[PDB]
Design a binder for this molecule. Structure first.
Ligand code: MG
Lengths: 1340, 301, 96, 50
């Protein structure tokens, strides 16, 4: 095992041999950004996709253009933490090369013309960590991924819109990535119509004119040409027999001489088969058969050029005769097998009055631009720009793909542009399924559904900024001088950066980090939503997308989402799932071959997955045979069932990939209900890292793999040995093999001490290790606020018991003892930020110093000469922190205070106090601060002090840095002397600086001398550069806001401990609040006096069914026992070999375990420290579904020599007798919360008010009044407390004279009311009158 | 108004007033100058459009925004939805002399009693105390009263108790679905920050000790004091008006312990003996002779 | 000057180039802002628009009214123990 | 649904059994998250009348 694993393991009950070592998990957005930065040459994405989509660009004249060259970034100016400190964003310089290429219009293309081939800076750009977030102004933040609807195409059919009918109206929509949508739609009257982006209806056939087509060219396509021919008297026609199919005969339908089908007789497949078989087409038919048919095409007389029958016009016997008289045998007509082939299009065509394409243009223009300006080029360019210009329309070739495959083409690609064949194939297809064939799809199928990561959206807004500039570009291209206008003489990058900062700061998604918990942050990262632009809405979206499609299986954990309006909307990703490069999704699946499962996989989509059959992982192979049971629960078709065995295509890898993470971490969920599960994993994320890192005991196995890729602590980049250790930092020696030649090969790791989140709780890091010891690579260095040996540790493993008490666990109510508090394992810590500004005024500059008027030196006692607190102190509400004062004017006072000042001689100055103080109700320890001051403002003395002190701290360690680094390297400058003799003690005792003056030789040994001089030079020079940079930026002042002069900030420290009302829970929805804490005496207790830790009324487990909690309790009750066996073996102090036996047997108990290990491989001391970690109780890993079972539990309990029920007598602490009966116990792992009453409870005597109504506020932060709803009024309405009603209306809110009078009456002892009339009333009167109304009162 | 940063803040309407001025100015300014009617028409359109915008931004047509990209709030919008005077600011109101906190149980308590973290009542009963200290003249006037308050003298608490006696108080949970979802109790003080109460009335409040919390109000005036003590005193309220239903059903545990008690095994022991009365029954079982669940003879009166 | 620098210019060298001191620069920069319209949702959920936060610190506080009234009445009580000419002088001379 | 459940929480679910258990749970919970709006709305109108 790993050394970290050599020192502590976790038992496991996995039996199913797992295929996978799960992937890296923060892969996704890191790679998204990596795309959006990285240089694609050709298959452009993001950055380059936007550029190439844009450049080059010509003038509005058509003279001059400008061209792309290349891009690059700078390294960011600064490191990270200095921005954490300054409250700044880190970001890289953007520069872009460009070539201002123009061509002589004098020549045709005489490119002997202007080329400013220069480069530009424009726009710094928020860069990424190695963990993904972007810090913004000292704010760690998270922009969030999205899912939404894909471009391409989507068809639907609303079922009984006007349900008066009960009819389907099919309809279609096509959506680009940019540009206009488009809608096709039916009516009950079997007529197609159209609208863009919800414009109005239009009969689609107008557009067919608009697209330059004729009725000929249309119904050529839509219909076949039913030809009649009149042979010298009589009508004949070729007939496809399967036009008369499920149809009825009108006249005696006979043959050349033979009757197949009489009148009124169905043309049975018998006689369809005959007409085929006997092979007749040319069939005598009565001429009447035409009458009612429509003419296919415009026919005339050649001598006339006049329609005797117009195209799409009904035929008649007079027309029959006449058209025959003009000379016509062949008569093309429509084919109307209304069952199959018939009227939808001719209907709308007749309904379509635009004789010509030209009128179609007119009325298009008109509806779109209502009014009467018509000209041609307007509508022409209009239409052309809608769907046939690159400017205002693009598919996202994703959409092209999806569209082509709705079309069943073979080209994934095209343009972002239309063609007319496609349009008509659509209209066709639409009509075709209107005849009955085909279907529409379910959006809930995830092949309709595409993600949106960052580079996409970044590209979007970036392109927009490019266009914001491009407007000006055209304007200043065609107009300005051409020879001399630089390319950057045109540029303003401000709209660009504006868009950046907007999206990087003004998006629903662009939000803070959720930081309390590595789970919280990392699942906040692997979170998904679908809101925002081209997104959804609470009011409008409904259940059906909130409800699940089975396609989710393996791609989306259904388990994990918030609870309220955001319930079915917000969802995270299942574990082993990934994306289509398009943005669609995939999951891997194991192929199934001949019964034998193929150990390969493939990343199937949502769609293929339905086609194939797929198997599970609960499945039982026949030991490299096949599925044992004939009937194997497999699945295809959007549904599962039982199948045969070699029949199968594919398999699920694991039992797991369906799920995601907090759901994953819970064992015995199989024994648990789902509501409780969702809630438990929901508040699993509301963690609190406690004072130490106390593990749990039951596991699942993933938790190690979790603890790492938070990035929360260091790892072994390179195995080695520890040089140096500090309470703040460490230093290592890298192994030679890992070391590279030029580099020295040593790392430092300087650690994270007490610091804050967005959610403003402690931060700290520290080593789990010792020094002068080997290290393997990839290992950890230091655990964190909630971490332990590379494994999470958030809560508290301890004891549990189950019983009611005297009303101290009534309804969900939980109870506890006091020793817990002595162990203060729940005790935790907080900090607050406090700061202030120095400003310049209309009177003068504000200032700070100890000098204040009317002071008690009590407060001053702790403040420096600059008027500022010294460190180490403790403070509480009302104390002073910094004495700030502001230049004041002058005023006057009443004769009474004049009488006061006139005898005491009370004298004053012309300045006001504006000094910082502790807020009411707060106290804590003074530990750290800072100051910021302008480059331009004198740094008030102690600023310089800490400034200098900063140079003390920083440079010292930088000294320390080279004091190691540089130092070691000089081994070379010594060591290479050893060859060719060596000055054995004439080297050492005399000074090292004069070793150059020792023995020297010719040819090869002056080269070493100048090598020495070169390293001398370079090595001192490097630190000179360091010093320069560092002392500068530490000397760098502060670009303050205009009027701001310098700034101070401070931090205290605060600690918090446990109390009733503080909320509590574990891992099942098992909430609770404390109503009491118990002295240990009256605690019930056991035969052995070892009393209880926790009490709980058991009643609620059956109703909520958090059953696995019990199972946990059993297991932990066991596992503690073994730690105790061990514990006994140590004071008793047994031996090696007995531990050897006992423990080897111990972990070698279970039925069919997967994991396997030997013990003699290890040393003694490894075992010693291992057991030393384990004496408290054995850690166990429960895979949820491949977990352990009842039998092994009871087995190992019997080894623990315990009652199998674990259900035992107690004695009451108060009476010392026994209770009635045995009671269950064990160990469970328990957890506390954010929801702390200290952060909650609040009263309001009398304080701040509103400003227009002068009504009290709301908020503990603002001493806010509490609100009184209508409902609360209605209870009184039942009751009738008219005086109280009056009271609460008037003086508690509105009546000012009233409230004041009452204040006095109460300090007078008087409890006597006065009303007035509220403010908001007369406010509203003035409002009415402002609206030109004579509202007015009728006085008594 | 300005802000501490020197930063200023306005209402929508000052724009719209401002708008019209200039147009009317450019009306009259033009009307000095003898224009074609067409421009006048245009101008009047601008004017009455602004007028509509005052009365309603988004009624007749496409609404009007600043660089917010959002509409400017109508005069009408001040009266409107909930947002206007009616539902926000007039019928529902913020209140002085009220508070809130997380809550918990008093199993020991009686009806009229209620757990009270004391600072709450402390700051909420201040002018009682200031009239009272002027009366005692320890604090002759009120500055010193507050000073001595900061000084934390034991007398305060006695004085505080000396106030608080017989001074009823109001209990408040939301959502308030019927008149019984709030109540009126008598105060009881405690060295904690979790409110203890008589659990049964969760049945009334539909409440549970799983993260619920509540708010509190004061009957200052004697009329309110006595209305409280007389009307939504709980002894005056035990049933529904919906039905003749006892609303204080013994909820969950008392029922069960009692069920277990009044119980007729045959199994335990001491079968077929005889008593005088339940006092010796206590003595007898409590001696450890007997079953509390066993049919055996006794006398009653 | 941003093309020149490639970066943001300081008031220092820009006051140099613009040929007049950082005084006027900063004096200007106190002006460069516009108002931000009371009713905006700094409550992200439509829960508290900015206008709802402010208190009006203009009027007075009742406790301080009682303070100053107790002052005035105690001075009445004191001056009541004075000679007639004294207190009448001392009243009308201060307008008490 | 056609195939009912066999195991319990004493025995332990299948993958699929819990997968399926998901659904109506979510549904009725969504309903639980919205009937109060209509409730308050209606009752408000009721007082609005009388
Ligand atoms: Mg509740």
């Amino acid at each position: 095992y790993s050394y970290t694993e050599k020192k502590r393991i976790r038992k496991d009950f996995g039996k199913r041999p797992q295929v996978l070592d799960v992937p890296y998990l923060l892969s996704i957005q890191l790679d998204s950004f990596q795309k959006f930065i990285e240089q694609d040459p050709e298959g452009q994405y993001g950055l380059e996709a936007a550029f190439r989509s844009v450049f080059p660009i010509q003038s509005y004249s058509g003279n001059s253009e400008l061209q792309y060259v290349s891009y690059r970034l700078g390294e960011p100016v600064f490191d990270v933490q200095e921005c954490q400190i300054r409250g700044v964003t880190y970001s890289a310089p953007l520069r872009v090369k460009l070539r201002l290429v123009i061509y002589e219009r004098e020549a045709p293309e005489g490119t002997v013309k202007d080329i400013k081939e220069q480069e530009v800076y424009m726009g710094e750009i928020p860069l990424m960590t190695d963990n993904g977030t972007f810090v913004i102004n000292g704010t760690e933040r998270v922009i969030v991924s999205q899912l939404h609807r894909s471009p391409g195409v989507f068809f639907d059919s609303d079922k009984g819109k006007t349900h008066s009918s009960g009819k389907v109206l099919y309809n279609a929509r096509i959506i680009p990535y940019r540009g206009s949508w488009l809608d096709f739609e039916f009516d009950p009257k079997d007529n197609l119509f159209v609208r863009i982006d919800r414009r109005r209806k239009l009969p689609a056939t107008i557009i067919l004119r608009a697209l330059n087509y004729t009725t000929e060219q249309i119904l050529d396509l839509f219909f076949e040409k039913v030809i009649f021919e009149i042979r010298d008297n009589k009508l004949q026609m070729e007939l496809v027999p399967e036009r008369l199919r499920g149809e009825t005969a009108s006249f005696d339908i006979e043959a050349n001489g033979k009757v197949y089908v009489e009148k009124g007789r169905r043309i049975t497949a018998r006689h369809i088969r005959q007409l085929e078989k006997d092979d007749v087409k040319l069939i005598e038919v009565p001429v009447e058969y035409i009458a009612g048919k429509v003419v296919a095409k415009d026919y005339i007389d050649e001598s006339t050029g006049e329609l005797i029958c117009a195209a799409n016009m009904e035929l008649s016997l007079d027309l029959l005769a006449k058209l025959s008289q003009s000379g016509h045998k062949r008569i093309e007509t429509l084919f109307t097998n209304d069952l199959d082939h018939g009227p939808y299009i001719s209907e709308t065509l007749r309904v379509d009055p635009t004789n010509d394409r030209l009128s179609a243009l007119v009325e298009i223009y008109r509806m779109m631009r209502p009014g009467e300006p018509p000209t041609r080029e307007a509508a022409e360019s209009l239409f052309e720009n809608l769907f046939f210009s690159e400017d205002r329309y693009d598919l996202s070739a994703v959409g092209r793909m999806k569209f082509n495959r709705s079309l069943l083409r073979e080209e994934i690609e095209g343009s972002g542009i239309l063609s007319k064949d496609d349009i008509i194939d659509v209209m066709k297809k639409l009509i075709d399924i209107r005849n009955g064939k085909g279907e529409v799809d379910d959006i809930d199928h995830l092949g309709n559904r595409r993600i949106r990561s960052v580079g996409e959206m970044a590209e979007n807004q970036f392109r927009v900024g490019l266009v914001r500039v491009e407007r000006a570009v055209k304007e200043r291209l065609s107009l300005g001088d051409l020879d001399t206008l630089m390319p950057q003489d045109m540029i303003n990058a401000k709209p660009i950066s504006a868009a950046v900062k907007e999206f990087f700061g003004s998006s629903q998604l662009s939000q803070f980090m959720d930081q309390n918990n590595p789970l919280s942050e990392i699942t906040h990262k692997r979170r998904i939503s679908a809101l925002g632009p081209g997104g959804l809405t609470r009011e409008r979206a409904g259940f059906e997308v909130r409800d699940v499609h089975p396609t989710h299986y393996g791609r989306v954990c259904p388990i994990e989402t918030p609870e309220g309006p955001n319930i079915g909307l917000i969802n995270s990703l299942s574990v082993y799932a990934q994306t289509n490069e398009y943005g669609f999704l995939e999951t891997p699946y194991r192929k199934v071959t001949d019964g034998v499962v193929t150990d390969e996989i493939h990343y199937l989509s949502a769609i293929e997955e339905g086609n194939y059959v797929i198997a599970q992982a609960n499945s039982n192979l026949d030991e490299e045979g096949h599925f044992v049971e004939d009937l194997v629960t497999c699945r295809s078709k959007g549904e599962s069932s039982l199948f045969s065995r070699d029949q199968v295509d594919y398999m699920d890898v694991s039992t797991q990939q369906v799920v995601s993470v907090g759901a994953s971490l819970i064992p015995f969920l199989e024994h648990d209900d789902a509501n409780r599960a969702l809630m438990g994993a929901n508040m699993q994320r509301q963690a609190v890292p406690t004072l130490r890192a106390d593990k749990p005991l039951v596991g699942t196995g993933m938790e190690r793999a979790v603890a790492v890729d938070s990035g929360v602590t260091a790892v072994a980049k390179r195995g080695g040995v520890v040089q140096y250790v500090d309470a703040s930092r460490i230093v290592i020696k890298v192994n030679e093999d890992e070391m590279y030649p030029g580099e020295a090969g040593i790392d430092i790791y300087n650690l994270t001490k007490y610091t804050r989140s967005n959610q403003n709780t402690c931060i700290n890091q520290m080593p789990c290790v010792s020094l002068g010891e080997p290290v393997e690579r990839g290992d950890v260095l230091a655990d964190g606020p909630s971490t332990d040996l590379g494994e999470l540790a958030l809560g508290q493993n301890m004891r549990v018991a189950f019983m009611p008490w005297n009303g101290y666990n009534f309804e969900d109510s939980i109870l506890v003892s006091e020793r817990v508090v002595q162990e203060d394992r729940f005790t935790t810590i907080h900090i607050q930020e406090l700061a202030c500004v120095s400003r310049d005024t209309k009177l003068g500059p504000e200032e700070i110093t100890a000098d204040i008027p009317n002071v008690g030196e009590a407060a001053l006692s702790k403040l420096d000469e600059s008027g500022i607190v010294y460190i180490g102190a403790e403070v509480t509400g009302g104390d002073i922190l910094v004495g700030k004062v502001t230049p004041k004017g002058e005023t006057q006072l009443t004769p009474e205070e004049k009488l006061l000042r006139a005898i005491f001689g009370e004298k004053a100055s012309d300045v006001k106090d504006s000094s910082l103080r502790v807020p009411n109700g707060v106290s804590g320890t003074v530990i750290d601060v800072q100051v910021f001051t302008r480059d331009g403002v004198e740094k008030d003395k102690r600023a310089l002090e800490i400034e200098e002190m900063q140079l003390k701290q920083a440079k010292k360690d930088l000294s320390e840095e080279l004091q190691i680094l540089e130092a070691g390297l000089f081994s070379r400058i010594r060591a290479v002397l050893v060859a060719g003799g060596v000055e054995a003690e004439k080297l050492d005792k005399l000074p090292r600086d004069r070793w150059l003056e020792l023995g020297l030789t010719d040819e090869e040994k002056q080269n070493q001398l100048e090598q020495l001089a070169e390293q001398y030079d370079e090595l001192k020079h490097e630190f000179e550069k360091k010093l320069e940079a560092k002392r500068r930026k530490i000397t760098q002042g502060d670009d303050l806001a205009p009027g701001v002069l310098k700034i101070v900030k401070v931090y205290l420290a605060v600690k918090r401990r446990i109390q009733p009302g503080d909320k509590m829970a574990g891992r099942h929805g098992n909430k609770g609040v404390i109503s009491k804490i118990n002295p240990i005496e009256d605690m019930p207790y056991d035969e052995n006096g070892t009393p209880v830790d926790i009490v709980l009324n058991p009643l609620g487990v059956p109703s909520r069914m958090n059953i696995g909690q019990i199972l946990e309790t059993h297991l932990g009750m066991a596992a503690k026992g073994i730690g105790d066996k061990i514990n006994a073996m140590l004071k008793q102090q047994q031996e090696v070999a007995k531990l050897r036996e006992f423990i080897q047997r111990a972990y070698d108990l279970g039925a069919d375990v997967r994991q396997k290990v030997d013990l003699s491989t290890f040393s003694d001391e490894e075992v010693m420290r291992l057991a030393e970690n384990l004496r408290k109780g054995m850690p166990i890993a429960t895979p949820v579904f491949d977990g352990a079972k009842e039998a092994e539990i009871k087995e190992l309990l019997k080894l623990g020599d315990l009652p199998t029920s674990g259900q035992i007598r107690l004695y009451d602490g108060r009476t010392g007798e026994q209770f009635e009966r045995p009671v269950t116990v064990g160990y469970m792992y328990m957890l506390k919360l954010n929801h702390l009453v200290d952060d909650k409870m609040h009263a309001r005597s009398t304080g701040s008010y509103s400003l227009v109504t002068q009504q009290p506020l709301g908020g503990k932060a603002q001493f806010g009044g509490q609100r009184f709803g209508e409902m609360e009024v209605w209870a009184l309405e039942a009751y009738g407390a008219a005086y109280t009603l009056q009271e609460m209306l008037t003086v508690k809110s509105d009546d000012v004279n009233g409230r004041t009078k009452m204040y006095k009456n109460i300090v007078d002892g008087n409890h006597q009311m006065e009303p007035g009339m509220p403010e908001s009333f007369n406010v509203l009167l003035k409002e009415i009158r402002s609206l030109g109304i004579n509202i007015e009162l009728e006085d008594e | 108004v300005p802000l501490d940063g020197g930063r200023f803040a306005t209402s929508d309407l000052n724009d719209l007033y401002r708008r019209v001025i200039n147009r009317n100015n450019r009306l009259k300014r033009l009307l000095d100058l003898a224009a074609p009617d067409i421009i006048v028409r245009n101008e009047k359109r601008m004017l009455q459009e602004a007028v509509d915008a005052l009365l309603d931004n988004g009624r007749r047509g496409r609404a009007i925004t600043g660089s917010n990209k959002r509409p400017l709030k109508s005069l009408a919008d001040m009266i409107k939805g909930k947002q206007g005077r009616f539902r926000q600011n007039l019928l529902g109101k913020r209140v002085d002399y009220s508070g809130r906190s997380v809550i918990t149980v008093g199993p020991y308590l009686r009806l009229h009693q209620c757990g009270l973290p004391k600072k709450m009542a402390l700051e909420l009963f201040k002018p009682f105390i200031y009239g009272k200290l002027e009366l005692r003249g320890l604090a002759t006037t009120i500055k010193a009263a507050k000073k001595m308050v900061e000084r934390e003298e034991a007398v305060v608490w006695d004085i505080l108790d000396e106030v608080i006696r017989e001074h009823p108080v109001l209990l408040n949970r939301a959502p308030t679905l019927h008149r019984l979802g709030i109540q009126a109790f008598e105060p009881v003080l405690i060295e904690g920050k979790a409110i203890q109460l008589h659990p049964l009335v969760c049945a009334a409040y539909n409440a549970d000790f799983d993260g619920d919390q509540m708010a509190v109000h004061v009957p200052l005036t004697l009329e309110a004091q006595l209305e409280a003590r007389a009307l939504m005193m709980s002894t005056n309220n035990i049933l529904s008006p919906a039905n003749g239903e006892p609303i204080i059903v013994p909820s969950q545990d008392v029922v069960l312990g009692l069920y277990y008690m009044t119980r007729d095994c045959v199994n335990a022991k001491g079968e077929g003996m005889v008593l005088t009365g339940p006092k010796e029954a206590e003595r007898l079982y409590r001696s450890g002779l007997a079953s509390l669940h066993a049919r055996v003879k006794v006398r009653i009166t | 000057m941003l093309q020149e620098m490639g970066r943001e210019p300081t008031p220092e060298e820009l006051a140099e180039r613009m040929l007049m001191p950082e005084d006027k620069i900063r004096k200007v920069l106190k002006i460069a802002k516009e108002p931000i319209s009371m009713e905006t949702p700094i409550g992200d959920d439509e829960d508290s628009h900015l206008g709802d936060f402010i208190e009006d610190t203009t009027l007075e506080l009742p406790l301080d009214s009682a303070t100053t009234e107790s002052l005035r009445a105690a001075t009445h009580d004191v001056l009541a123990g004075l000679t007639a000419r004294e207190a009448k002088v001392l009243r009308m001379r201060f307008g008490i | 649904i056609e195939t009912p459940i066999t195991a319990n929480f004493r025995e332990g679910l299948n993958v699929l059994q819990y997968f399926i258990s998901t659904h109506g749970a979510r549904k009725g919970l969504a309903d639980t998250a919205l009937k109060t709006a209509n409730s308050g709305y209606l009752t408000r109108r009721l007082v609005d009348v009388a």
